[PDB]
Design a protein around this ligand. Structure first.
Ligand SMILES: NCCNS(=O)(=O)c1cccc2cnccc12
Lengths: 13, 348
């Protein structure tokens, strides 16, 4: 199981 | 050896020509970095192409050319501490020049927003096509991967780190070639940098572990991309970011049984936790990648010249066609009568 949609960038931790 | 006389010399001379190309490219980059517009009412807004900023298809009123206009809220950029990143994005895109990097055409700001007007790439995101088809065959994935290798060879030679490789940020152009977008985490980095940023599935372990890391995080990300293109899913896969991070740091990669041994070898050397061993970070530099067996059929010059037949050519229904993009909720572009964050964005 995991993320199949578009993935947002992270800016911290 | 592996190569006979003619092969060995041809490759050596090839590598020397790359050095010469890169030296000239750096001259041109630095000149533009040293001596670098429009306004909103010059464009008709048509449709939103992506959200995250927000990117809209626009049409230039005087010429009728279509463009992709990135709109950033100045207040949102300040709150998220992305001021420097957003200045990096504009300045870098303004100065680079490479066939697989999206071209910035105009940039400007108003009371509420920053705007970056880029070439419109109508074939859609690699992400959509990948999720639709499932996975790419190895030759198909290799065609795209070769373009990323060349793009990173170019960027890294300019001491530019990219830091957000993923299929969402790779657009397919009318000839089936790649356009890299999204330079918001791109940065001039001679050596180490420390910002925790990127997309979870694509982060190298040294980022997650809060190390001062270097341009080799881009080569790790290339391994993630190649894996995801060839498998249909990335190597470190979980519903929540913390679970993703735990898998990355373990590093224990498993491969589909349809992966060739050449592909697995390449990926074990890119998805290498030990930086003294990671391809792209060693004495032989990018040539460890370009000369790997999985790339033995790749004519690097022909890829650069766009003379290789692409595995997939998007259906192009005309100028302004958005049929290769998903639909998004459309929001007003509201411009306050009061200037916001003028001091923060003076250099923009
Ligand atoms: N990160 C998602 C990439 N897609 S996007 O943001 O809509 C996007 C961003 C930058 C340039 C583009 C050119 N043509 C189409 C889309 C463009």
């Amino acid at each position: 199981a995991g993320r199949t949609g578009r993935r947002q960038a992270i800016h911290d931790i | 050896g592996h190569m006979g006389n003619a092969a060995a010399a041809k490759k050596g001379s090839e590598q020397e020509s790359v050095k010469e190309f890169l030296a000239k490219a750096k001259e041109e980059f630095l000149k533009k970095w040293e001596s670098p517009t429009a306004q909103l009412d010059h464009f008709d807004r048509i449709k939103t192409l992506g959200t995250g900023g927000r990117v809209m298809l626009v049409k230039h009123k005087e010429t009728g050319n279509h463009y992709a206009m990135k709109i950033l809220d100045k207040q949102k950029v300040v709150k998220l501490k992305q001021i420097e990143h957003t200045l990096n994005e504009k300045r870098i895109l303004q100065a680079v020049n490479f066939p697989f990097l999206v071209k910035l055409e105009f940039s400007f700001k108003d009371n509420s927003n920053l705007y970056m007007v880029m070439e419109y790439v109508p074939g859609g995101e690699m992400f959509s096509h990948l999720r639709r088809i499932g996975r790419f065959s190895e030759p198909h994935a290799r065609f795209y991967a070769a373009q990323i290798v060349l793009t990173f060879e170019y960027l890294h030679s300019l001491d530019l780190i990219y830091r957000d490789l993923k299929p969402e940020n790779l657009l397919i152009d009318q000839q089936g070639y790649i356009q890299v977008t999204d330079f918001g985490f791109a940065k001039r980095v001679k050596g180490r940098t420390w910002t925790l940023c990127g997309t979870p599935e694509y982060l190298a372990p040294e980022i997650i572990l809060s190390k001062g890391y270097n341009k080799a995080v881009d080569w790790w990300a290339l391994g993630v991309l190649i894996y995801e293109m060839a498998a249909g899913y990335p190597p470190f896969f979980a519903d929540q970011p913390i679970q993703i991070y735990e898998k990355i740091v373990s590093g224990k990669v498993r491969f589909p049984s349809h992966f060739s041994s050449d592909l697995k070898d390449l990926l074990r050397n890119l998805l290498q936790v030990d930086l003294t061993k990671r391809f792209g970070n060693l004495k032989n530099g990018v040539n460890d990648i370009k000369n790997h067996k999985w790339f033995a059929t790749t004519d690097w010059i022909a890829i650069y010249q766009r003379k290789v037949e692409a595995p997939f050519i998007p259906k192009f229904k005309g100028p302004g066609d958005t049929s290769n993009f998903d639909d998004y909720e459309e929001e007003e572009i509201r411009v306050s009568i009061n200037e916001k964050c003028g001091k923060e964005f003076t250099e923009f």
